[model samples]
Target: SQKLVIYNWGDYIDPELLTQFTEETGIQVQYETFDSNEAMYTKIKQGGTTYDIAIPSEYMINKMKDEDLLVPLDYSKIEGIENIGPEFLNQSFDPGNKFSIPYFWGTLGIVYNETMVDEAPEHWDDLWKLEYKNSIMLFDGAREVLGLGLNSLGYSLNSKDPQQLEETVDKLYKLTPNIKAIVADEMKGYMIQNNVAIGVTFSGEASQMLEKNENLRYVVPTEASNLWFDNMVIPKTVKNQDSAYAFINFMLKPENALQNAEYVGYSTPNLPAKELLPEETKEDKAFYPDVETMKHLEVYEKFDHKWTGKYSDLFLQFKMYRK
Candidate 1:
């Protein structure tokens, strides 16, 4: 009787949930996939999308909120609100919980095949080892690439200082000898087949690869790293507000959240859903690290276009330094 347009990260959800939600509510879901936050944001920003819901990362949500591209959530309509954990609520990007709800969160860190690496990579500096030359892969994204570079050098991941940015990129160029490839969606495939030794990517993506390749291990640097969250939001472009709320709550349901977490291989922000995870997963520190360790991690800030362009340009130059 109703329809929803949900735009989310590709391969980030279980297909059966769409059928289940439709069966329970008679709401047909027109699920669409996006490769990155930028793709989802630009599509909505340029207009012409009938998108009712979007899954954007923390900083992007701040940008969306500032741009007036999001609708304030009416919590009264969402009984599932109680199901979310307190820790995940009132995050800096949406303090007061007005516009979005946490979906999946993970850190940017190392994923290494134990057999390929002589010892566990305990810190970001470990990747710069000459031994890893021509044997490493990095996830394809400017912010993540530059953010890691920033943090590795003791600068904030969101640093907008021109001097720091230039220095970070220069330091990053020294890593070109080790850069096997910069990949995105295909990251898992390469890792699964043992095509790469060690790579930097999100915990959730690394978890999936870990399941496939038994020799693999994932870690968040004890020294520093970026912690990110992708949350569900109702865009101002929504054609079906009621259906959007319905879908959000349906996904928020404990069982649904657990199923999505198990199927998608990401850390669940839903506390109830997290409890249902197996002991191995529940106790997995890298998957759900200690709060103190997490406190040391930084989240990206919404940067202005000039700063954004600078970050991207520097990362590009770093990527091409050796080639």
Candidate 2:
């Protein structure tokens, strides 16, 4: 069997868990990490690297499909596919698990020092208010930064209009002076240092900080925030396809999935695993959102290719401006 190479977000998956698959299948597993989707895309697009399996967000999956950079999944090899709940399998991004399989899912929102702020921030615009200036840390990514501005204007994150893109850029530019820093993969170090009062990040990272820092709290903004799902996909250059499938199937097992979910601190899409989660995991609002809150939220969707190019350019302009 070919050696398995998997690329995923830093610390998102449990390395020890992989041993179970390796022990059972005798496939040598080699793991790699990427800090962001853009970085992963840039590398894969260059054509030399081989990634047997990769985890990317919904929009990235569409981009890969459009570019023919990913291979259609071979369900026959992925025996435990049934373990994923129907709700997640039906996602609009890849309905019926045609392109990818849900790995981890959650929303992006604000993490703040609850004791410091008299009232919690409720919307995206709240980040620009005087109270947040020089006290907020924003994620340093084109999609997330620009998406926040677009969502604040009552526009979808996938808006393609040239005018809408321009407006989003202008609005984000207005908040640049107040932004203390553009945080990337090392958000934990920054949050623990108390270098910024509020952090804009995904639920998993925010929840992690809240657990360790007594003063921290995370909230999904009332106006809107990101609802994102990262999926496990096979890249075009997959070297050990069979082993990769075995690895994915291994993770889908109820006991294994439960342990992985507990370690990562992200919400699991596996219903069987949910039943095994601790009571605290079930009750944590940030991880297991109620029906009402879930109804109001929206997941990221693919944007027009033409609009993505325009938005990418405008975001570059905004990022270049001096603080």
Candidate 3:
């Protein structure tokens, strides 16, 4: 039997799909998980793992491509590639659909409980308000947390200017006292239990939380937010390239894509799969924002190594700061 190795975000896929893929194609899959893009990149860069396929976010895909770590996809192998929405194609990070194919896409936003706040939180600035002190959960990732600070201050998410970064770091430092916790997946439970009144969260996780609690609400801040895409790519080091293409093609099939999207609760870029989604999910603004609202969303760009190091340093500084 042919063997394929996949590295993806933890719990990001429906396990059954992997089973089905293996059963149908007789290709055995060895799956692995990583919590962050950086972790996956570090592993792949260090040259230990031989993962045949990987799911990487947009910015990280560019970073990998820059280092010649990815293989250009064979379009002919992906039968239903056209099902992907036009907007999802030709992205700046990997134009002409050469290196990556979008798997799922979503935006970062504010998740709040209606019962706890009198009005909906409309901007990132609201997280800094004294009234909400110790009741806000910020995303722990450096780019995510710093991106919020950059957006709130009217700067680019990929801003490399020393002065702008200093201001961004200062803003985040001031808001640190108000932050109840810098968390990732745990924010969902915190919001559902009303432990945290507000949080910075991804749209998919927000949708899942809203389903469990009527009082919970999510919004893409009017100022702006991160629009991100997780895509499937084959690394240059892949040994089972045929199985890699098979897995990608299988996932792109409408029925398969629909199943994964519904289970994952993230927006599907596959137009056919999207059409098969329930009306409620199709209408959910948190999951699929209208075009007008999409205007305020921005995709992160690959930053220079100097700026990336600076972002990490600034976040570490904020975490070390005390009241």
Candidate 4:
């Protein structure tokens, strides 16, 4: 008998699946949830505690690997590797995914209420149009908010140049009249209840919102935007290595991946699991962009500490200036 401690995003998986895994493997699972990659990194970096498993986004995985905070996963012990799509493998962040495996992949986009907008927005600039004043909601994430801001200006979402970032924030501030609320988890509730006409959110959150509100429609901006991948990794602090491998293999199964994707409402990285999806879902360009749109999406390049601080500080200032 063994216990595996996993730290992952809140509401990211089906809780019942945990019970199923424990029943099947006889491994007791201790799970914890974190809201942001920064928060997860700090807790693990502080060193008072340890976790056998952690699910973090691509950029954070790169940061952890650089800091020696992750363990190289043993592929021999991990089953069902072939079930994952070849496109999701060997990403630039992990360089052949030595320390991580993708859990979900998605893009950042606008979730707009169909009836409220004059016309369906197809471009990032549409959000800033004069008619949208005092009717927009934005995610509180620095990378996300700023990412959209950069995209609207035709700048790279992962721009590192100080001038480009500075100009991006300046342009974002121009939309203060349209900004009703800048929120995190609360955005979903406000959106579903129709408190705001448009919200900037990850594809997964938009998926859930789109389901509950028939009037809602999601669209990736015609301009460039964020393409993110959250992956499962074994931290260096792991105490139950055996249980960790068991849990990874179990979750890797196409069946479990399909269930998790349906519950969480995100795009799964598993190809076979995606094969099980209905054509309606597979055909939706908003949740899953086509090849032409795919070419324009940018994966976040892990910014160094200073750039991260600058990004957040600019976003904070933008929020403070929201009068």
Candidate 5:
């Protein structure tokens, strides 16, 4: 029996899943977790380690594909590829089902305690309002924070124009004094404790918060915010393609997909699994939004390396800035 190693976001999979797969297939499986995409990318790109399966966002997968760091998936070996929604298949990031498959998809938006705040905030600009000072937290990612600023200013999330990037950073700098904290991995905890009144986070984290804190509410900002998908892909260093295929196929099973959805609290890209989900999970607009609400969404695109470096530098400077 061959062994397969899977690396994905922290706390993303049900622990029993690996046990179930190992029990059924006799293929030993190991799982590792990463806090963020940047951390995972840096480790994988260094080349000493190999993950048979990895979950990377659409933009990072695009960058990896262009660099030849990903192995082309053999979809024929994947059982549930046909079960995924068609719209998820031909996404611009990897058209024609070439290198990656959708794992989880959601939007970047504001999650707030409706009880603490009198009214629902309808726009990203509301995040910068004075009343919320020292009560709001933002995603610690450079692009996510700056992109929210850009979107509020009506700029594209992929804008590589130096002037636009600088402008966005400048606007965000003004909000620094008001920010309570820039949360990286701990936004959910802070939200639950009422330590933070509002925070920007992906739908998965927000959905989980709402499950426990009934007062919590989420807003799909009025501006063009990010529509993100963390997808599954094989790395170039994978030696056991057969086991990898088995792992992906195992995840595609409707029951397995439901388990993943219940564990992760994100919208499943698999339609069959979605249909099987409990009525409450299926009907939650925060998890599965209608078509009209999805219209304003945008996905991040790969940027030139030079621009990436510049953005990185500017964001670092912002982090180090002191009032």
Candidate 6:
């Protein structure tokens, strides 16, 4: 039997579905997980593994494309490419849907416990308030955490100007006093347990947390937030091109797309799959934000490595100071 290897985020897909895919296609699947986008990129760049398919956020898709690490998708081989929403197409990162197919999309927002705060936060600045001191959790992601600081200061999320980035670092340093912790996946548990009054999180995790805790509420800060899309793409080093296309096309099927989205708690880009979702999930503003809400959200753009590294450095400094 042929084999297809996939590199994806941990716990990002349903295990049962993998079994079903292999059963139906007769292709054994080897799956691997990475904790962060940088980690995943480093592994792929280092050339140890032959990952036929990978799930990367939009910005990373562009980076990979620029580096000639990805191949343009053969849309004719994809059965349900038409099911993707029009809004998700021709995005800045992958114009004309050339290299990647959007798998899941979400926004970064605040997940707060109503009982801990008198009122909901409307902007990123609210996280810096004295009232919430030592009770706010920030994402540990470099671009995400730094983007919040940049947006609060009216700078672009993908700012390359050294002056603006310096300002962002200063702003984050000033807000450090109010920050309880800088976390990633752990923030979901912290919010559910009411350990943090507020947290910066992706909409999917917020949706999952809200389902578990009635006291929780999620909001995209009015100032602006990151609108992210995790897309499926084939790397240039893919060994099984036929299986890669088969896997992506299988995932694009309406039922499979809906199942994965429902299981992962992320918004699906497949219009047909979205129609099959429950009314509650369809109506959850956090899960599928409205047009006006989307206007205030910005998708991260590809940046030069120098500036990107600075973002990581700034966040590292912040973490070191927190310790």
Please write out the lDDT profile of model 3 over residues 157-238, one tens digit for every residue: 8778888878998898888678888889888899988887898988878878988999998888766889889999998879
lDDT, candidate 6, 207-271, per-residue tens: 88988999999988766788889999998889999999989988989999999988888899998
Each model's lDDT comes to 0.87, 0.80, 0.87, 0.88, 0.83, 0.87
Q: Over the full model, what C-alpha lDDT does candidate 6 score relative to the true structure?
A: 0.87
> Per-residue lDDT tens digits of candidate 5, residues 1-323?
58998989888888899999889888898788898778999988998897899999887898888889998887678787887887577777898869998889989888998877766777888877778768788888878887888888889877887789888888888887668888866898888887778889888778888878877888787547888888999999887788889889998888998898888778998999999999988987766776666766778776677877877888888888834
Error of 3 at 138 (Å): 1.5
Residue pairs whose backbone atoms clash in candidate 1 = none
lDDT of 5 at 47: 84
Query: In candidate 1, what are the lDDT values of residues 93-143, reduced to their tens digit?
Result: 888979999998888889998998888887888889999988888988898
Q: Can you tell me which runs of candidate 6 are displaced by over 4 Å?
A: 161-177, 309-323
lDDT tens string, model 4, 1-323?
A: 58999999999999999999999989998989999888999998887687999999887888889999999999999999998877778876898879999999988899999888898888888888999998988888899888888888888888888888888889988988898888887899988998889998888888888889999999987568888899999999899999999989988999999889888888988988888887887678887777778778888777778998999898888888885
List the candidates' TM-scores in order: 0.87, 0.81, 0.85, 0.87, 0.85, 0.85
TM-score of 5: 0.85
- Candidate 5 Cα outliers beyond 4 Å, as residue runs: 46-50, 161-178, 309-322
lDDT of 6 at 244: 97
Candidate 6 clashes between residue pairs 3 or more apart in a chain or in different chains = none
Give one digit per residue, the lDDT tens place, for model 2 in 1-323.
55799888889887778787788788888888998879999988987988999999887887888899988888878877778876577677777777798888888888888776768876788888877767878887777888888888888776667788788888888887678888775777777777778888888788778778878877776556677789999899987878778878888888888899888888898988998899988777767776665655676666576766766777779868833
**Candidate 1 lDDT:** 0.87
Give me candidate 2's TM-score against the actual structure: 0.81
Root-mean-square deviation of candidate 2:
3.4
Count of backbone collisions within predicted model 5:
0
